[PDB]
Design a binder for this molecule. Structure first.
Ligand SMILES: C=C(C)[C@]12C[C@@H](C)[C@@]34O[C@](Cc5ccccc5)(O[C@@H]1[C@@H]3C=C(COC(=O)Cc1ccc(O)c(OC)c1)C[C@]1(O)C(=O)C(C)=C[C@@H]41)O2
Ligand SMILES: CCCCCCCCCCCCCCCC(=O)O[C@H](COC(=O)CCCCCC)COP(=O)(O)OCCN
Ligand SMILES: CNC[C@H](O)[C@H](O)[C@H](O)[C@H](O)CO
Lengths: 536, 54
């Protein structure tokens, strides 16, 4: 057996299974080879930045991952040394986790992995009827379903959530339960366990709070039980709460604007109240405004502590939370400057006020029609302008310092004024009024016209072509983006909910099968779906 | 028949035809089944925001 730091733990049984030699496997198991050896070398670990073969480190996992069912049945059933179906690796991944890891969302891989998963579950039920493999979590606390949801494996997820077995002695492993069928319509029940209420890590939490790299982040919500769940939750209670929140935010911004507009103009804050109506209403509005700022501040901190987003994806996701938090920061800095007796609180207040209105666009998310504008603004700012700033500032600074150096004595003799005027030229509102008497006028004109041609004509339209391409990229994807935002809203409304109830269930705690492997019956919170399909 | 508000009016002849059982259809017609009963439950009526079979 290999003893190095690269192939640590690899042994002959792995080579026999890997080579697909039934005879050598039978002989090795006969001679007392260890059927639960851990090949955990760096070649065998789960990793992206190094070539390797991760299979779950175990011969049973290797057999399952390589599409060799006969060897699996041999290892599990053979009496020389039977293999434990529920063994786990150093990552804690069992055979089912290993099977999830080797998916790649292709047709043939889906067929292989779905088949092997189904067969292993049936065999596991037969060998250990009291064993529940699907509830075993790996080291990260993920069940195989949660791992599939996080990884974006659409095929495995679609199979599991719509799983049905028409066979006694393993029917309790089904999740989809067809109750009837008519011509185009059929009514079925869906198991729903650990979709909504798992208390540790549900499927919807995993899909919603994924890190935007997941290959099928938005297609996963089209899988039928999830889509029906989100539609039911939306229509049932969440929609009203969302509209109420939007209305309350509108009232808050109206009060804030009215209070801000009527600030006193006298020097040296803070200002003392006179026994007059306008002062009472103004101070009331101020208190409400600062209250709203403090509320959004603590909501922002709670979000960041709960999610723990990384710096690399801090802005790629969580754009809206960052903007609401920055609004809160400007409000608090304004309060600090206010009671510190400085006029400069006006400056801080003003920025928050401006932000307060544009954050209203957050509420157009979740509309099929309107959310595309918020999404387009986000992507344009985060990609195109942030990349383009380096190029444009190189041009601006180059010609700016050139012109400042050339010119002595005038309005174009300081960095500030010349940078502002060159920026004006770039957005097409300059003057070009070459009417001043100064030396080197020809070179000045050549520089300025070169700048105009380079930035106004060329670079600006380069930027516009790129932004237009970005918009046409996501003209098509509106339907999925809408659903994903709706899902995030539904979960966020579920979490707080401000009533002490957690009525997050759909249909009754119905008896699903009634016939466990033991004499008990299973009640499982099934959810009814009446589907229609006009095929044939 | 179904006497509830959802499958109102469905009877054995409709089930026989739906299952594509020619023999059972022949038998039910022979035995005096009503070949003009109206299956007018909400499952069977025209509707938009609900699955059904009109
Ligand atoms: C934190 C960031 C990244 C940000 C905060 C401020 C300064 C911001 O400018 C930027 C940089 C900027 C400034 C000027 C022009 C373009 C970009 O982009 C946003 C930020 C960007 C915007 C414009 O973006 C929007 O359309 C708001 C918005 C879009 C999509 C949403 O989902 C959303 O939900 C909250 C809000 C509004 C400002 O916050 C605003 O009102 C002021 C005064 C400046 C805008 O800095
Ligand atoms: C789209 C791609 C193709 C674009 C091609 C760009 C064509 C732009 C042509 C603009 C030419 C404008 C010249 C300015 C004239 C001027 O303002 O006058 C000039 C000032 O001198 C100069 O700057 C030299 C000429 C500048 C060299 C310029 C390439 C001569 O002297 P006067 O001041 O006495 O003129 C006395 C009259 N008041
Ligand atoms: C309207 N007088 C000049 C404007 O200030 C502006 O610079 C110009 O019209 C735009 O470049 C053309 O739309």
């Amino acid at each position: 057996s290999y003893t190095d730091s690269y192939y640590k733990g690899q042994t002959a049984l792995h080579i026999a299974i890997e080579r697909r030699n039934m005879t050598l496997v039978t002989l090795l198991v006969e001679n007392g080879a260890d059927v639960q050896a851990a090949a955990n070398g760096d070649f065998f670990k789960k990793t992206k930045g190094r070539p390797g073969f991760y299979f779950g480190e175990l011969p049973l996992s290797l057999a399952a991952c390589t599409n060799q069912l006969a060897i699996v049945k041999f290892l599990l059933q053979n009496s020389w040394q039977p293999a434990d179906i529920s063994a786990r690796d150093s990552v804690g991944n069992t055979v089912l986790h290993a099977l999830v890891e080797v998916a790649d969302n292709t047709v043939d891989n889906t067929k292989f992995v779905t088949s092997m998963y189904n067969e292993i579950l049936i065999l596991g039920a037969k060998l250990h009827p009291t064993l529940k493999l699907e509830e075993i979590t790996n080291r990260k606390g993920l069940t195989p379903l949660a791992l599939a949801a996080s990884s974006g494996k659409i095929g495995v997820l679609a199979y599991i959530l719509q799983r049905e077995i028409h066979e006694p002695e393993c029917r309790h492993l089904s999740r989809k339960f067809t109750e009837w069928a008519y011509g185009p319509v059929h009514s079925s029940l869906y198991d729903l366990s650990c979709i909504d209420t798992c208390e540790k890590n549900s499927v919807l939490e995993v899909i919603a709070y994924s890190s935007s790299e997941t290959p099928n982040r938005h297609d996963m919500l089209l899988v039928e039980p999830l889509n029906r769940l989100l539609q039911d939750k939306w229509d049932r209670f969440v929609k009203r709460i969302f509209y109420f929140n939007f209305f309350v935010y509108c009232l808050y911004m109206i009060i804030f604007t009215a209070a801000a507009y009527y600030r006193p103009v006298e020097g040296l804050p803070p200002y003392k109240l006179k026994n007059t109506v306008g002062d009472y209403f103004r101070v009331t509005g101020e208190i409400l405004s600062v209250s709203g700022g403090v509320y959004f501040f603590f909501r922002g901190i709670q979000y960041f502590l709960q999610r723990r987003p990384s710096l690399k994806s801090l802005f790629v996701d969580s754009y809206s939370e960052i903007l609401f938090f920055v609004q809160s920061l400007f409000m608090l800095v304004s309060v600090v400057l206010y009671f510190s007796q400085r006029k400069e609180y006006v400056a801080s207040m003003v920025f928050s006020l401006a932000m307060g209105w544009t954050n209203m666009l957050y509420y157009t998310r979740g509309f099929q029609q309107m959310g595309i504008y918020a999404v387009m603004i986000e992507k344009m700012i985060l990609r195109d302008l942030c990349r383009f700033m380096f190029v444009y500032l190189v041009f601006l600074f180059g010609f700016s310092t050139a012109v400042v150096t050339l010119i002595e004595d005038g309005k174009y003799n300081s960095l500030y004024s010349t940078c502002l005027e060159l920026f004006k030229f770039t957005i097409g509102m300059g003057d070009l009024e070459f009417t001043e008497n100064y030396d080197f006028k020809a070179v000045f004109i050549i520089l300025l016209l070169a700048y105009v041609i380079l930035t106004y004509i060329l670079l600006l339209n380069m930027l516009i072509a790129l932004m237009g391409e970005t918009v046409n990229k996501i003209a098509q994807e509106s339907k999925n983006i809408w659903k994903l935002q709706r899902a995030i809203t539904i979960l966020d409304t579920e979490k707080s909910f401000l009533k002490c109830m957690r009525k997050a269930f759909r249909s009754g705690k119905l008896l699903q099968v009634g016939f466990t492997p033991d004499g008990k019956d299973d009640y499982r919170w099934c959810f009814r779906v009446d589907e229609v399909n006009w095929t044939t």
